[PDB]
Design a protein around this nucleic acid. Structure first.
Lengths: 49, 103, 100, 836, 79, 332, 183, 48, 95
RNA sequence: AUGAUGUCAUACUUAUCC
């Protein structure tokens, strides 16, 4: 989910938010639980567990 | 400086766990906020895994009270002997023991 | 304007007194606050230019030297046919700067 | 943030740590005041807002209860005072009906602001009392402030009078008239009438020119006090007439009419201050009379005016001074009579070292003397005051110096004879050679004298410039800058008379000082060079530009506010005018040095900078230099960038943008956002400067605006919208409207937001789009939104529809659709359906 | 005669001074009457539109002008 | 498809026409006002033909055309009221054959709006000031004064607006070098817009208000005002001062009432009709236009009705008041 | 005092444009007449939203912008990229830029007068209605048939489609050139 | 219990579509989508 | 209320209204002042005065209860003076 | 899966200003 910006910043793809510094994107790993919201996309991609 | 935010503290703990302990220049090139000496001081003060940040008891208070009179200065010498080893919790405990016993 | 958003204009009746601009605010427009395309001169109100209030700048309010003019973008947008834009109020500007 | 040892008394309740258990918690949380008073500037800001939005919540009672003690504090600062004034304003923009009980309780502290040594304090005070009176009701103010009229102390009476002046400016004269007119006829005691009359005066000063309509009624009020048995009432009365007439611009003479005949009579019989006051009134009156009636009446006033020159009273001397201005500055007065009767006593008693040391007396004296010169002529006045240029004291020399300055400014030097002119030039040099302080008066004085003398000054040059060089050493810190500026202003005179040796002198001599380490000097030096460039041309420069310009180039590091200014200016003049003398390499180095001059805290520096950058852009050509602009890191958010943007604009003008655009439009690709919005701004200013030529490039910019206006982040929509605006004004009438409609589609959703800059941006946008597209299409987007009872859509679409409505209201007629008629009303306009 | 209604001022804001601008709380009948008054003023101002309106009807120009001036006040009735 | 519009025949219909010494000589010119062009006509006194001296396109809809001249002058100016938001004072030059704009001051926005002045424009007979007002809620009066080099100069205009008031027609009062007054037909529509029952709409007649401009105070104020019996369409300025008594004649439907200000009583006279008229009796009769012929001996007026009946209007007067209005049908 | 939506839709001649917020207006008849005009445009969709029409594109990181072919065919982008790489001059031509600005000028894709900007306006790249008998190039490439598309061989057997009954496709009842094999 | 989510989404709202076989809807948007649906069109076609 | 009927001070006297207004001001404000007499003189100086503006000026001058009664007593005496052909109130015919 | 509010950094604008 870590993506680099064009001005020397980071941007979260899964959280769909901006990160001011390198520590901001590194603190949206334990937080910004967009990984738990991917269960709907995983169930839509595969109907079985 | 040195505000020591939580997102910087987690990055410093990850850099200490990944890179190493005796490499302070390698850990300071991934934070963009502090120098290598400040990162080593933070790792030895608050980010150390052996630091007892809680559980202040009466045995440690009696050990620190029976040590501040034998040596009035040099609180850094009594940091690892008392068992706190944070170099600032000893002065804070001494200030708390001096303020609570004054009333 | 873009520098002072809390400033209010006079918008009084237009007289025959031609407006002027200070040496520190020379070339700046009154409405558009630009530096290019001057098309129409600035006219001041009758009460806004009387005695010691004559020969003063409209925007800066200091000692006016050259005559002020309006921008062509404000002239084509009919923003110059309004009242006299004399700066009457002065808030949140040049107040704490006098203390330092 | 910390508590001063005294402020404890106020803030003690905050000290105790008991917490978390109604009103007591509102007073307790209201200590945010303390955060406003003392603390860091950010704490003051955030605190200030937080208390603004809590106004309606806490109510005026608790606030003022917890404030007025502080603003009443004996130890109060300057700043702290001003800040509490700010919070009182900001909370009084909201609270309206609430303040009614506290109005007096406010004014008591505030009225001392009206009488103060600080000016800004006074304009603030008048402002907040305006907001209070207008905020409260008229009857609230009136019924409030009566008992202060008869109060024993005159202080409260006075400051209260100025209060009524402010509130009367708020709610208008006619509303408050019957109150006053009732007051001045009060038969109880005189003090009241004294107050009310003072109120008439302070209304005269405050309202000033705008008194005009009610002047008659006002006079009809005040007239009855002139004959009163008490003295004060008479004095202050006639004074108020004075203030009236002085705000009474050449008209309403007959309104003062019935007032005269007593006044003139009083002029005979009075001793002391009241007399002088009458002289003040009559003085301001006379310019308003007819030169025939005022002939007689004037000739009567002149006698007493003469006799009364000699009084030690300084009030006296002020009055009779300004009088002499108005009486003797009358077109209907004869010169010779003044020359004989007046001038000798005038220069005898009035010109002395008591006057000049004072401020007002200084100025007014200057003016009066100037006007006497305006009548009797030049050589007289000057000829009598020249000998005083050589007098010891400064301030006196300064006085006669500025007097000579204004005189020779108006009348012209042609009247002056020869010998007196020798005494002139020698006087001016001599006075100029001793300067205790740095000031313009001596300099502007000299310059005006010389430029007025024209080439009659030529025999005097070598003495001048000899002094100019020798002084040009003496002391660099103090006098270098001053002698330099002297050169700067004397340039043209040292030119037109064709003394070339002198231009050699100043050229290389000044050239040598460019290594001076003191900035405040060096600046004046560069200025002098500038002025020398504007007289002698490029190819004739005695320090050929090949020498000069690269010698200038390194100086740009100098930080200094005056060096940078004059320097950049001169680099501008030479870079604009000749520009061939210097090879391109030097130029591009100048560029890479100019780039960081945009850190300037001053706006004029950036001004000259950008214009220069355009000039050298012409000297070289676009591509390289616009690339060097696009190099920019954007690093500073608060401006420091958009000036480079302006350079991109002007550069795009200096040679056709018809070349430049593809580079820019490509440079929007870069993922770095702030430079993306940067190039958006570049388009904005670009179209603002190009105007008509955008009839083509509209298409090129159209899809990119599509990408930008489609929102990554608000600044995109904003800036892009501004681009749509300036494009929309620029292209008008040339037939490109279609694509502008397409762009209007993507503009249209952005209508809704609370962010001030984007909403005002969008407003400008849709206004320009209004004029370009024509109203019909606008209105066709604005119809359905009107109706909407939802507390948002109607607010906005009605704001828009108003913007569309004010302008072009004439052309809207055709486009109002057909709306069917209901029961009680006929909503069809049948006129349009009349068919031949 | 306590009225407790002094529409004087507040903080030198709003205070509508123009005619025909309208507000967000403007009713439909007031806006329709303002649009009808603006249409009557535009018919009275434009000479070609007044000539085209008077050429169709059998009335004169001054009579139609007086009829349009007389119908300006209270065109609908209920605001 | 880029087209180019060109004019082959100019517009011959005249919307306004003034007469006076526009050329500055003894011959009088005829300043005609077309739709989108200004025209200056000069009738030949010997040949009896009217020749077009000048024809310039103003590129706009001119809504008012009046002429004025200062005291002691020898040339009449040309005040032109158009659809733009600026008032233009023109002065024709016979040596250059072109109309030179003397002064041009902007007052509002462009377009034929109800709040935009330019529909009505009245000039003082003494040439001291000019008054330009809109159809409703806008009125401005600018002062005209000669300079030291005999150049016409304008001063700052005086605002005289009145909310919810409609102006039918305005005309300056002929004063003998005193304070100039501007009489106009006013109609307050504030009561009719706040009554859904329609009772306030009825019984609301026009009010003739005379606003005087105080020259000593540099401000205009509504000095005199009086309601009328019926609605009026146009006014007729009667010359006063040394030549005749002051006052104005208000034209109305089937009636004419000249009512001067002060203690002068209102004298009304019904409009005479043709004998055995084939038209409908329910239709009224009003005036279409009016001309004024002023001489040193006496003065007369010529007003045409709705049927084109040009009547010679004459007014008998006493030493200080008016006695009766004697009208006679001149021709058809 | 306020009519319902069904009564406002039954009274209006064009009830396909009435909304739920139009009943709360002061005059629904005039709003329904103005909303059913010929060349009228609707209001934006941010009248009821709370995102102020600019806060919805938070995590979307697409291409900031794209240069046209007339600027890309001049070589200024590569020179600017080389200058940025050197900083982190060219002087190619002066008449080629004028030729790309005048002769090699490409007209951009404009929009209609009613084509207002939507909220997203990037994921709804709708285009007419490419129906039965008409397909795009590339999908021809995946299909790989040289110049009927071969499942209109099975539109022989199984019958004309229920979904598009009016159908004609080449060679069957429709007696075809280039791409388009049915109408 | 998502009370605030069901209140913001528009749940527990009284609505009924008599054209769609006299069915009930828990929201206004659900009532608007149920009026133009497969069951509503089938009932309209069966009614004639 | 009682301040809705249009009146005119030109058809009524001014010397007969000073004692009743003085008694009303002495009853309301307790003592005799010079600002209230001046306000009462300024309120009757115009030929067409305003009853609502005078009530606002005297509606809050006292407390908001005696001023309403003073305005209601001054409007009825002025109405009785303007309705009479002489131009005097009812309290001046007896004495 | 938007939205809600709130502690808390981070960028941006106002040609903001000694």
């Amino acid at each position: 989910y870590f993506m680099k910006n064009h001005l020397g910043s980071y941007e979260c793809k899964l959280c769909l938010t901006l990160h001011n510094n390198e520590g901001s994107y590194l603190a949206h790993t334990q937080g910004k639980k967009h990984q738990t919201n991917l269960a709907r996309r995983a169930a839509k991609e595969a109907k079985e567990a | 400086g040195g505000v020591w935010r939580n997102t910087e503290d987690e990055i410093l703990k990850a850099a200490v766990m990944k890179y190493g302990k005796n490499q302070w220049s390698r850990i300071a090139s991934l934070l963009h906020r502090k120098s290598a000496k400040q990162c080593k001081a933070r790792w030895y003060e608050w980010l150390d895994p052996s630091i007892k940040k809680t559980e202040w008891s009466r045995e440690e208070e009696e050990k620190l009270l029976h040590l501040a009179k034998l040596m009035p200065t040099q609180w850094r010498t009594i940091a690892p002997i008392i068992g706190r080893t944070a170099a600032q919790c000893l002065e804070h405990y001494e200030f708390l023991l001096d303020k609570a016993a004054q009333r | 304007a873009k520098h002072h958003p809390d400033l209010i204009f006079c918008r009084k009746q237009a007289g025959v007194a031609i407006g002027r601009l200070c040496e520190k605010c020379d070339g700046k427009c009154v409405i558009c606050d630009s530096y290019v395309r001057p098309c129409t001169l600035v006219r001041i109100c009758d009460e806004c230019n009387y005695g010691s209030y004559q020969g003063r700048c409209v925007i800066c309010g200091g000692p006016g030297v050259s005559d002020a003019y309006y921008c062509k973008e404000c002239t084509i947008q009919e923003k110059d046919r309004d009242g006299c834009p004399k700066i009457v109020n002065l808030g949140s500007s040049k107040t704490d700067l006098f203390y330092e | 943030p910390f508590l001063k040892p005294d402020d404890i008394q106020y803030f003690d309740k905050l000290l105790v740590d008991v917490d978390e258990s109604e009103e007591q918690k509102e007073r307790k949380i209201m200590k945010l005041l303390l955060k406003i008073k003392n603390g860091t500037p950010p704490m003051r800001k955030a605190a200030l807002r937080q208390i603004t939005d809590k106004a309606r919540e806490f109510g005026a009672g608790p606030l003022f209860n917890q404030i007025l003690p502080l603003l009443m504090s004996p130890t109060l600062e300057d700043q702290e005072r001003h800040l509490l004034v700010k919070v009182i304003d900001r909370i009084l923009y909201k609270l309206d009906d609430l303040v009614r009980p506290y109005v007096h309780k406010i004014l008591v502290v505030i009225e001392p602001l009206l009488i103060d040594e600080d000016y800004y304090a006074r304009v603030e005070g008048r402002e907040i009392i305006s907001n209070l009176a207008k905020a409260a009701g008229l009857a609230t103010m009136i019924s409030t402030m009566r008992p202060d009229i008869d109060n024993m102390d005159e202080y409260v009476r006075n400051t209260t009078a100025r209060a009524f002046a402010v509130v009367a400016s708020a709610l208008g004269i006619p509303s408050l008239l019957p109150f006053l007119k009732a007051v001045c006829k009060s038969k109880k005691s005189w003090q009241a009438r004294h107050t009310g009359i003072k109120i008439v005066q302070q209304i005269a000063i405050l309202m000033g020119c705008a008194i005009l309509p009610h002047l008659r009624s006002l006079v009809e009020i005040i007239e009855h006090g002139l004959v009163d048995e008490q003295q004060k009432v008479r004095t202050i009365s006639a004074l108020a007439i004075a203030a009236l007439a002085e705000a009474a611009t050449p008209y309403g003479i007959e309104s003062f009419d019935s007032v005269l005949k007593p006044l003139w009579k009083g002029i005979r019989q009075h001793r002391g201050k009241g007399l002088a006051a009458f002289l003040k009134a009559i003085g301001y009156l006379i310019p308003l009379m007819d030169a025939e009636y005022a002939n007689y009446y004037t000739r009567e006033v002149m006698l007493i005016l003469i006799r009364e020159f000699q009084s030690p009273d300084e009030e006296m001397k002020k009055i009779v001074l300004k009088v002499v201005k108005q009486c003797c500055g009358t077109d209907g007065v004869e010169a010779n009579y003044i020359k004989t009767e007046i001038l000798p006593p005038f220069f005898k008693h009035f010109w002395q070292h008591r006057m000049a040391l004072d401020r007002r007396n200084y100025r007014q004296l200057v003016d009066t003397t100037v006007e006497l010169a305006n009548k009797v002529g030049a050589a007289e006045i000057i000829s009598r005051i020249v000998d005083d240029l050589k007098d010891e004291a400064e301030q006196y020399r300064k006085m006669v110096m500025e007097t000579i300055e204004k005189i020779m400014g108006n009348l012209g030097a042609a009247d002056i004879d020869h010998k007196l002119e020798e005494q002139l030039i020698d006087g001016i040099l001599y006075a100029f050679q001793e300067q205790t302080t740095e000031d313009s008066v001596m300099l502007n004085g000299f310059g005006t004298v010389v430029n007025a003398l024209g080439k009659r000054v030529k025999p005097y040059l070598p003495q001048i410039c000899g002094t100019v060089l020798w002084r040009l050493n003496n002391k660099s810190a103090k006098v270098r800058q001053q002698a330099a500026d002297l050169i700067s202003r004397t340039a043209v005179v040292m030119k037109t008379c064709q003394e070339e040796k002198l231009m050699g002198h100043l050229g290389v001599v000044l050239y040598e000082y460019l290594g001076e380490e003191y900035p405040e000097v060096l600046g004046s030096i560069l200025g002098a060079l500038k002025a020398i460039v504007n007289v002698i041309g490029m190819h004739k420069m005695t320090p050929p530009i090949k020498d000069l310009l690269p010698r200038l180039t390194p100086i740009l590091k100098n930080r200094h506010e005056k060096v940078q200014e004059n320097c950049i200016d001169l680099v501008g003049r030479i870079a604009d005018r000749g520009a061939e003398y210097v090879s391109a390499r030097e130029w591009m180095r100048i560029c890479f040095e100019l780039l960081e001059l945009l850190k300037a805290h001053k706006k004029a520096i950036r001004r000259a900078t950008v214009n220069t950058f355009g000039y050298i852009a012409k000297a070289i050509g676009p591509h390289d230099v616009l690339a060097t602009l696009l190099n920019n890191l954007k690093v500073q958010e608060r401006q420091n960038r958009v000036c480079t943007t302006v350079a991109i604009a002007i550069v795009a003008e200096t040679c056709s943008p018809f070349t430049v655009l593809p580079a820019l439009m490509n440079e929007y690709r870069v993922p770095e956002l702030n430079v993306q919005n940067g190039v958006l701004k570049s388009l904005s200013f670009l179209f603002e400067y190009i105007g008509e030529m955008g009839k083509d490039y509209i298409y090129a910019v159209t899809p990119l605006l599509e990408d930008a206006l489609m929102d990554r982040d608000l600044v995109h929509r904003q800036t892009a919208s501004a681009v749509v605006q300036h494009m929309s004004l620029g292209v008008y009438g040339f037939g490109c409207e279609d694509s502008l409609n397409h762009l209007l589609n993507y503009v249209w959703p952005n209508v809704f937001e609370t962010s001030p800059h984007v909403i005002q941006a969008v407003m400008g946008a849709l206004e320009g789009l209004r004029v370009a597209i024509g109203p019909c299409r606008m209105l066709q987007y604005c119809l359905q939104g009107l109706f909407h009872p939802a507390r948002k859509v109607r607010d906005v679409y009605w704001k828009i529809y108003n913007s569309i409505y004010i302008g072009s209201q004439d052309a809207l007629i055709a486009h109002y659709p057909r709306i069917y008629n209901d029961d009680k009303n006929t909503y069809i306009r049948y006129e349009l359906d009349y068919i031949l | 005669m306590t009225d407790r209604y002094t529409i004087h001022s507040q903080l030198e804001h709003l205070q509508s001074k123009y005619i025909g601008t309208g507000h967000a709380d403007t009713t439909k009948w007031e806006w329709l009457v303002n649009q009808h008054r603006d249409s009557y003023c535009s018919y009275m101002g434009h000479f070609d539109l007044l000539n085209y309106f008077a050429i169709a009807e059998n009335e004169s120009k001054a009579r139609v002008r007086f009829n349009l001036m007389e119908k300006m006040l209270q065109p609908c009735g209920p605001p | 498809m880029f087209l180019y519009n060109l004019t082959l025949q100019r517009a011959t219909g005249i919307s306004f026409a003034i007469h006076g010494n526009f050329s500055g000589t003894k011959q009088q010119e005829i300043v005609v006002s077309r739709g989108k062009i200004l025209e200056l006509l000069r009738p030949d006194p010997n040949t009896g033909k009217v020749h077009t001296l000048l024809t310039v396109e103003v590129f706009g809809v001119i809504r008012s055309l009046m002429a004025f001249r200062l005291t002691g002058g020898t040339k009449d100016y040309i005040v032109v009221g158009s659809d733009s938001g600026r008032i233009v004072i023109l002065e024709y030059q016979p040596s250059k054959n072109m109309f030179e704009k003397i002064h041009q001051e902007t007052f509002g926005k462009s377009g034929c709006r109800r709040i935009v002045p330019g529909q009505f424009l009245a000039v003082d007979p003494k040439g001291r000031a000019v008054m330009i007002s809109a159809i409703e809620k806008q009125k401005l009066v600018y002062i005209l004064n000669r300079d030291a080099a005999a150049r016409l100069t304008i001063s700052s205009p005086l605002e005289a607006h009145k909310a919810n008031t409609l102006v039918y027609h305005v005309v300056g009062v002929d004063v003998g070098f005193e304070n100039p007054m501007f009489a106009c037909l006013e109609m307050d529509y504030e009561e009719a817009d706040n009554d859904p029952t329609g009772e306030a709409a009825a019984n609301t007649q026009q009010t003739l208000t005379f606003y005087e401009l105080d020259l000593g105070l540099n401000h205009v104020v509504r000095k005199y005002s009086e309601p009328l019996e019926e609605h009026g369409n146009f006014l007729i300025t009667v010359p006063g001062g040394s030549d005749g008594p002051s006052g104005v004649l208000i034209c109305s439907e089937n009636y004419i009432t000249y009512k001067n200000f002060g203690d002068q009583p209102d004298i009304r006279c019904p409009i005479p009709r043709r004998r055995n008229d084939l038209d409908d009796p329910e239709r009224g009769m009003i005036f279409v236009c009016s001309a004024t012929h002023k001489t040193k001996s006496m003065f007369f007026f010529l007003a045409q009705t709705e049927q084109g009946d040009i009547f010679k209007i004459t007014l008998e007067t006493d030493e200080d008041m008016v006695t009766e209005i004697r009208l006679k049908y001149f021709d058809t | 005092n306020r009519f319902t939506v069904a009564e406002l839709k039954q009274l209006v001649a064009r009830p396909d444009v009435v909304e739920m917020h139009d009943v709360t207006a002061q005059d629904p008849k005039l709003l329904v007449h103005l909303k059913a005009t010929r060349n009228s445009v609707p209001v934006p969709r941010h009248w009821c939203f709370k995102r102020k029409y600019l806060q919805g594109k938070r995590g979307i990181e697409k291409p900031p912008f794209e240069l046209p072919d007339f600027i890309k065919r001049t070589g200024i982008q590569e020179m600017r990229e080389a200058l940025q790489e050197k900083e982190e001059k060219i002087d190619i031509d002066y008449q080629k830029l004028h030729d790309a600005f005048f002769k090699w000028q490409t007209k951009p894709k404009l929009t209609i007068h009613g084509d207002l900007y939507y909220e997203g306006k990037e994921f709804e790249t709708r285009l007419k209605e490419k129906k039965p008998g008409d397909l795009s190039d590339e999908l021809r490439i995946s299909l790989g048939m040289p110049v009927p598309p071969p499942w209109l061989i099975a539109m022989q057997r199984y019958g004309p489609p229920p979904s598009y009954p009016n159908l004609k496709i080449p060679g069957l009842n429709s007696p075809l050139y280039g791409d388009v094999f049915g109408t | 219990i998502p009370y605030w989510l069901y209140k913001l989404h528009g749940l527990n709202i009284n609505y009924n579509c008599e054209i769609c076989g006299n069915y009930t809807y828990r929201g206004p948007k659900a009532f608007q989508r149920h009026f133009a649906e497969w069951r509503h069109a089938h009932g309209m076609r069966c009614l004639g | 209320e009682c301040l809705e009927k249009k009146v005119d001070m030109s058809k009524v006297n001014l010397e007969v209204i000073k004692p009743w207004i003085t008694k009303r001001v002495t009853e309301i404000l307790g003592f005799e002042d010079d600002v209230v007499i001046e306000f009462i003189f300024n309120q009757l100086e115009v030929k067409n005065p305003d009853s609502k503006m005078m009530q606002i000026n005297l509606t809050g001058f006292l407390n908001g209860k005696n001023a309403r009664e003073f305005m209601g007593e001054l409007w009825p005496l002025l109405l009785s003076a303007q309705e009479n052909i002489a131009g005097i109130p009812s309290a001046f015919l007896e004495l």
